[PDB]
């Protein structure tokens, strides 16, 4: 089910949150560390259903951000559906340490022939969200590869379509 969170505006009046309109819904696009948004557990890909008792259906990115700015008082309430587009895929490294995909800017772009990624039906045009439960959104590609290299032989990745 969806969940309810209550954010408290910081000093500037911000909450560390960027939103994006997709298919006439509103989705979390970026969550800054140590923000009011991170304190209530918002994540990339979460769907925002309501802000302050208003449905977000059909809102533009621009509107959503204005609303957040001009919200009266210091408490902002939201109802969230947790990452509705997330999927988890489990892969197994081969004897060269590879799971079998190519990525660029946090997005899977090719699946390697005869690999665990191929066997398991990993898809391209998908953003890499977590590796073994570790958030990797906004990390450099080199950092993502570094995390993959020290996960085990069993690598679970959380992805969502881009």
């Amino acid at each position: 089910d969806p969940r309810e969170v209550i954010l408290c505006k910081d000093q500037d009046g911000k909450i560390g949150l960027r939103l994006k309109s997709i298919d006439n819904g509103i989705f979390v696009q970026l969550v800054q560390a140590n923000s009011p948004a991170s304190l209530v557990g918002l994540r990339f890909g979460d769907q925002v259903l309501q802000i302050n008792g208003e449905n977000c259906a059909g809102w533009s990115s621009d509107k959503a951000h204005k609303v957040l700015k001009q919200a009266f008082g210091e408490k902002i309430t939201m109802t969230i559906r947790d990452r509705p587009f997330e999927r988890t895929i489990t892969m197994h490294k081969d004897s060269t340490g590879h799971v079998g995909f190519i990525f660029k800017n946090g997005k899977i772009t090719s699946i390697v022939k005869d690999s665990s990624a191929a066997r398991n039906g990993l898809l391209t045009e998908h953003n890499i969200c977590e590796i073994n439960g570790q958030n990797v959104i906004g990390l450099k590609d080199s950092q993502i590869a570094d995390i993959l290299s020290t996960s085990g032989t069993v690598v679970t990745i959380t992805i969502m379509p881009a």
Binding site: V99, I102, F103, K104, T109, V112, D141, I144, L148
Partner: peptide, 5 residues
């Protein structure tokens, strides 16, 4: 650069 993993 792309990363092959």
């Amino acid at each position: 650069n792309e990363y092959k993993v």
